[PDB]
Amino acid sequence: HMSRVQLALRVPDLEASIGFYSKLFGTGPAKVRPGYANFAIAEPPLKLVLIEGAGEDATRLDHLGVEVEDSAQVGHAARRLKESGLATVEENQDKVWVTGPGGEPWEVYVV
Ligand code: NI
Numbered sequence: 001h002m003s004r005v006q007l008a009l010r011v012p013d014l015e016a017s018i019g020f021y022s023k024l025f026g027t028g029p030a031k032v033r034p035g036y037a038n039f040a041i042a043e044p045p046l047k048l049v050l051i052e053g054a055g056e057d058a059t060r061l062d063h064l065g066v067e068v069e070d071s072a073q074v075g076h077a078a079r080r081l082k083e084s085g086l087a088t089v090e091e092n093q094d095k096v097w098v099t100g101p102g103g104e105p106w107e108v109y110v111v
Pocket of ligand 1: 006008049063065107
């Protein structure tokens, strides 16, 4: 209906995490690859991405994002974000990246 947040977690155990999230949100993954899984959750509106970690023992934040409706929304956000003094990097618009002050990366992207 509108844009949704994208939470990408680096997880130590991809299979265990798929099963927990399937129970948390009541649905199975939309896509499953080696080392990668994703969920398109309708309520709460969310794109949850699970990325299999290499070394560490605990789940960490990999990146955050805002999944918008069409490519045109990406360009609108890109223009909005720049007029604000935020340093943006565009991929070609299909994706814009900005980084928060503590280093957390955000992508605004069309799916
Ligand atoms: Ni992503």
